[PDB]
Design a protein around this ligand. Structure first.
Ligand SMILES: CN1CCN(c2cc(-c3ccncc3)c(-c3ccc4ccccc4c3)nn2)CC1
Ligand SMILES: CN1CCN(c2cc(-c3ccncc3)c(-c3ccc4ccccc4c3)nn2)CC1
Ligand SMILES: Fc1ccc(-c2n[nH]cc2-c2ccncc2)cc1
Ligand SMILES: [Cl-]
Length: 336
C-alpha cells in the first residue's frame, strides 16, 4: 500500500518524500518547480525529484499540472525525459496539494557543455542524432515541443541526451513565431535543432537577437527575405506589409558561412534552416540524412503510441483538474 514519508526543508522549500528516496540535495529551482538529486534505495540509482510549485493555485496552474503529468506518463523513449515515479504525501483527494515527479538523474545540460568545450564533429553527429530521434517520437504523437534550446537538453558524461521541458529562448525560435503566426506546425522544432546544431559546430549562437524584431532581422540576413511562394501564405496584412517593406536580401551561401564544418553537416543545416516551414526537413527525414550514417538505424527509431490531447480544449473547474491529476497519480504504473 502507501509507504512511509519523511519531511525536511531544503532552500526554504519543504520536501515530503517516501523513505526509498534518500540523501536529497538541491540541483536547482525553476519557475515551475524545484529539483533535488537523490538516491533511490529500491533501484540503486541516482534520481532527480521535482516538486511542482503551487500546482493548483489557479485553473491555469491546475491544467498545466495535469498536462505535464499526462505528457510525462506518455513519454517512453531513450531520448525523452520519462517518469520513474510520481507521488504525493496525501492519503485522499481532499488533502491533495503536492505533486512530486521522479526521473533518472542527468548530470548536465547542453548549454553547460557548449560553453566549456567546442565539440568535435563526431559529438555533434551523436547529439543531433539523439535530438532528432527524440523529436521523431514526440512528433509522431502530434505533439510540438515549441521550446527546444540547449538548456532544455539534458546530457550525461556518456554523451547520452534527453529532451526536457516538452540563454534566451528567442534565439532558437522559428521566424514564423516571431511573426506571430498562429498556425505554425511541428517544423518550428526542426528550426530550433538547426540553430542548436550551428551553435555546436561554430561555438557561437547563430541568431542572438535582442528582441523579436532584431531576431527576425538576423534570420533574414542569413536565409534571405521571403520569396514569392512564401509571401502568398502570409494572411496578416501588417506582417506581410512589414516583410515586403524591408530591403530585399539574398540567401547566403551556407558553404561560405559555415566553411570548415563537415560539408554533410552543412547540407543538413541548409535543409533545416529553410524560411518556409512547409519546405523544412522533418525529423524522420533528417534521421536518414547521410550525416548520421554511423548512427542511423530505421529499425530502432520508434514512434509513439497515440496521444489524446482533447483535454487541451476543455474549460473545467480547479477541483476537476485537481481530481483528474489525482487519478493520474493513482493509476501510474512504474516501468519494468
Ligand atoms: C518508520 N520505519 C519504516 C520506514 N523507515 C525506513 C524505510 C526504508 C525503506 C526504503 C525503501 N523501501 C522500504 C523501506 C529505509 C531505507 C532502506 C534501505 C536503505 C538503504 C540504504 C540507505 C538508506 C536506506 C533506508 N529506511 N527507513 C523508517 C522506519
Ligand atoms: C535551464 N534548464 C536547466 C535544467 N532544467 C531541468 C532539469 C531537470 C533535470 C535535472 C537533472 N536530472 C534530470 C532532470 C528537470 C527535471 C527534474 C526532475 C524530473 C522528474 C520527473 C520528470 C521530469 C523531470 C525534469 N527539469 N528541468 C530546465 C532548465
Ligand atoms: F519573414 C518571414 C519569416 C517566416 C515566414 C514563414 N515561414 N513559414 C511559415 C511562415 C508564415 C509566417 C506568417 N504567416 C504565415 C506563414 C514568413 C515570412
Ligand atoms: Cl531547475
Amino acid at each position: 500500500e502507501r509507504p512511509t514519508f519523511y519531511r525536511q526543508e531544503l532552500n526554504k522549500t519543504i520536501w515530503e518524500v517516501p523513505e526509498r528516496y534518500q540523501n536529497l540535495s538541491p540541483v536547482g529551482s525553476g519557475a515551475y518547480g524545484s529539483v533535488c538529486a537523490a538516491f533511490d534505495t529500491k533501484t540503486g540509482l541516482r534520481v532527480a525529484v521535482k516538486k511542482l510549485s503551487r500546482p493548483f493555485q489557479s485553473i491555469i496552474h491546475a491544467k498545466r499540472t495535469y498536462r505535464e503529468l499526462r505528457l510525462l506518463k506518455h513519454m517512453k523513449h531513450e531520448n525523452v525525459i520519462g517518469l520513474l515515479d510520481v507521488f504525493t504525501p496525501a492519503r485522499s483527494l481532499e488533502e491533495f496539494n503536492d505533486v512530486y515527479l521522479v526521473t533518472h538523474l542527468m548530470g548536465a545540460d547542453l548549454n553547460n557543455i557548449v560553453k566549456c568545450q567546442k565539440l568535435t564533429d563526431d559529438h555533434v553527429q551523436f547529439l543531433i542524432y539523439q535530438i532528432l530521434r527524440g523529436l521523431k517520437y514526440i512528433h509522431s504523437a502530434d505533439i510540438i515541443h515549441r521550446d527546444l534550446k540547449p538548456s532544455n537538453l539534458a546530457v550525461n558524461e556518456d554523451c547520452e541526451l534527453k529532451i526536457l521541458d516538452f540563454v534566451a529562448t528567442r534565439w532558437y525560435r522559428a521566424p514564423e513565431i516571431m511573426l506571430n503566426w498562429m498556425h505554425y506546425n511541428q517544423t518550428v522544432d526542426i528550426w530550433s535543432v538547426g540553430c542548436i546544431m550551428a551553435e555546436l559546430l561554430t561555438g557561437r549562437t547563430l541568431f542572438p537577437g535582442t528582441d523579436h524584431i532584431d531576431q527576425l532581422k538576423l534570420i533574414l540576413r542569413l536565409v534571405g527575405t521571403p520569396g514569392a511562394e512564401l509571401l502568398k501564405k502570409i494572411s496578416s496584412e501588417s506582417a506581410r506589409n512589414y516583410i515586403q517593406s524591408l530591403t530585399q536580401m539574398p540567401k547566403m551561401n551556407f558553404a561560405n558561412v559555415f566553411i570548415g564544418a563537415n560539408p554533410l553537416a552543412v547540407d543538413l543545416l541548409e535543409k533545416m534552416l529553410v524560411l518556409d516551414s512547409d519546405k523544412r526537413i522533418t525529423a524522420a527525414q533528417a534521421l536518414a540524412h547521410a550525416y548520421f550514417a554511423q548512427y542511423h538505424d530505421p529499425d530502432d527509431e520508434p514512434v509513439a503510441d497515440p496521444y489524446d490531447q482533447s483535454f487541451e480544449s476543455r474549460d473545467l473547474l480547479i477541483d476537476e483538474w485537481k481530481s483528474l491529476t489525482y487519478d493520474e497519480v493513482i493509476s501510474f504504473v512504474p516501468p519494468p
